[PDB]
Design a binder for this molecule. Structure first.
Ligand code: HEM
Length: 154
């Protein structure tokens, strides 16, 4: 798939607002993921012990990982589809080391969309949401193709 320039502009416009508070958005997204799909917490040996939302909010380690996740995703979105070099090491770690199925990447995609709609309603109307969904679908489609090349396919 291919996004139009206008689609990328909608994506990068709301992303610029996210970037005013990367740590805050990263915490909100991971907490939303873990609340909505508890099974995904199981993949994180680092965070598996956290019992409540309150404990998640207080964790410095979870906030640091939120920043890592959004910084990587930001770097990919800013390539506007030209992201093959960026995606290779991420696909390799997530297939071979962390064993993250494609379904869980759909779950975090949903979490991203929920938080942007909650925090940026004026810059995340229907057309901007459609553009962000397309961008995240492109990301998942290309990571899935790399999973297959690497021997995981899950
Ligand atoms: C937008 C999607 C995602 C991005 C951009 C992303 C990014 C990253 C990055 C950059 C790292 C550190 C370097 C590495 O190990 O590759 C990482 C680590 C990790 N990711 Fe992801 N990730 C994503 C989705 C997920 C999902 C959905 C899961 C599991 C449900 C997951 C599980 C892990 C685990 C277990 C680690 C290691 C954490 C630790 O340090 O103990 N990732 N991810």
């Amino acid at each position: 798939m291919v996004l139009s320039e206008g689609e990328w502009q909608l994506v990068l416009h709301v992303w610029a607002k996210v970037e005013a508070d990367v740590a805050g958005h990263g915490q909100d997204i991971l907490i939303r993921l873990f609340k909505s799909h508890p099974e995904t917490l199981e993949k994180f040996d680092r965070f598996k012990h956290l019992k409540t939302e309150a404990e998640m909010k207080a964790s410095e380690d979870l906030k640091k990982h939120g920043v890592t996740v959004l910084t990587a995703l930001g770097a990919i979105l800013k390539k506007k589809g030209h992201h093959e070099a960026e995606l290779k090491p991420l696909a390799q770690s997530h297939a071979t080391k962390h064993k993250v199925p494609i379904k869980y990447l759909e779950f975090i995609s949903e979490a991203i969309i929920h938080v942007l709609h909650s925090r940026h309603p004026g810059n995340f109307g229907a057309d901007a949401q459609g553009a962000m969904n397309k961008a995240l679908e492109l990301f998942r489609k290309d990571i899935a193709a790399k999973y297959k090349e690497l021997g995981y396919q899950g």
